[PDB]
Amino acid sequence: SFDCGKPQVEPKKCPVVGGCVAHPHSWPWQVSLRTRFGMHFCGGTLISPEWVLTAAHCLEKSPRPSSYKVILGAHQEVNLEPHVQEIEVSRLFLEPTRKDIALLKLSSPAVITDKVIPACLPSPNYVVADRTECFITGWGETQGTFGAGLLKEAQLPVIENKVCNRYEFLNGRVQSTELCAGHLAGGTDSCQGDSGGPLVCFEKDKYILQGVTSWGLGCARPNKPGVYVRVSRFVTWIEGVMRNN
């Protein structure tokens, strides 16, 4: 009884390196991906009770679903609250054109609560406009900024691909199935441990998943925005996997 994309605790939305610590449970689709006996190493986004979207490179350690588990409803990176859901992964579906996106099927459906709610997917092939303010979240490296060990958020503007691909920026590296976000001055960015997590943009009354954290030329460097897989180019594929599996 919770609509996708609508947090039950309002996000702080403060103007992960930089940014701020999120209000607990204000990003209820945020997933922590772990190995069977391991700690957090990547993020993900709950997109339905049985399905988590992440980056394909987060599965490089093992091709077997039994190697992975997801933590839902968390705020701490290490000290799990006495209400979080821990669910083993049952299947791995990597994007077939070899782009950096993958679906995890959960061994049992997540219980949807005020703290665990799926994100909404965009319309197929939607292109986020230049300068749109979006939010990235995760438990990654902070490079000396406050908030290590807690779920962090940062608000970053999207940079259109034609700009991001200029020589002084990312010099032709960014593909049409990727998008860029960040401040050219640097200082605020997703970082190691944030891969696979969400980039969301607010539209009307809910948050829409537009990016999956993927790579960068470092983190938070001036003139080097972060790169995210463009979710809208994969919605049709995602829908097909869920429908057929």
């Binding site: 957090h40 190493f41 990547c42 980056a55 490179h57 987060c58 490089e60 950096d100 990654g140 490296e141 590296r173 997703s190 970082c191 190691q192 441990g193 944030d194 891969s195 696979g196 954290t213 993927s214 790579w215 960068g216 030329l217 470092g218 983190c219 972060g226």
Partner: peptide
């Protein structure tokens, strides 16, 4: 110079 944002990062010569 590309590095993924996983722990640990996967890095490339560029």
């Amino acid at each position: 110079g590309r590095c993924t944002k996983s722990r640990p990062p996967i890095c490339f010569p560029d």
